[PDB]
Amino acid sequence: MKLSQDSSQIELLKELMDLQKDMVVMLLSMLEGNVVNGTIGKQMVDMLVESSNNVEMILKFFDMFLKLKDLTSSDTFKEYDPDGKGVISKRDFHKAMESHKHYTQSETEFLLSCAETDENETLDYEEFVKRFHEPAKDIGFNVA
């Protein structure tokens, strides 16, 4: 939530997401071959409960960005967008994702903050989704 708001460190965000991916891969390799009530798993759950705040915050991030695909594929957003040229006005975006109303007001304003404001005033929701949803899918699958 630091790098996402700015648009100048997208490559750094990608490197960080890849690091997170390999981290979760290591954790899965650790869980490989576990038995019921295994000591390795118990140590892992102790780790998670110690990191409870960070884990729930990351999970909230992933849940927030994983609904964006349904948001952009919604027929409501499809009618707010005159035709599939790829870019939608900022006001249309805010109205659309608030009629979608699965997003709270805080989540709303955070999405606008994370979406780069262009001088065209029509933020490219296509690039936004293809830049955020896919890393979220990748890491969230391993987390799940």
From Swiss-Prot:
Section covered of the full-length record: 3956 to 4099 of 4967
Effect of residue 23 to I: Changed ryanodine-sensitive calcium-release channel activity characterized by increased sensitivity to cytosolic calcium activation
Induction (record text): By TGFB1.
Organism: Homo sapiens
Record protein name field: Ryanodine receptor 2
Tissues in which the UniProt entry reports expression: Detected in heart muscle (at protein level). Heart muscle, brain (cerebellum and hippocampus) and placenta.
Post-translational modification comment from the UniProt entry: Channel activity is modulated by phosphorylation. Phosphorylation is increased in failing heart, leading to calcium leaks and increased cytoplasmic Ca(2+) levels.
Phenotype for residue 40 to V: Decreased function in release of sequestered calcium ion into cytosol by sarcoplasmic reticulum. Changed ryanodine-sensitive calcium-release channel activity
Top-level taxon: Eukaryota
Similarity field: Belongs to the ryanodine receptor (TC 1.A.3.1) family. RYR2 subfamily.
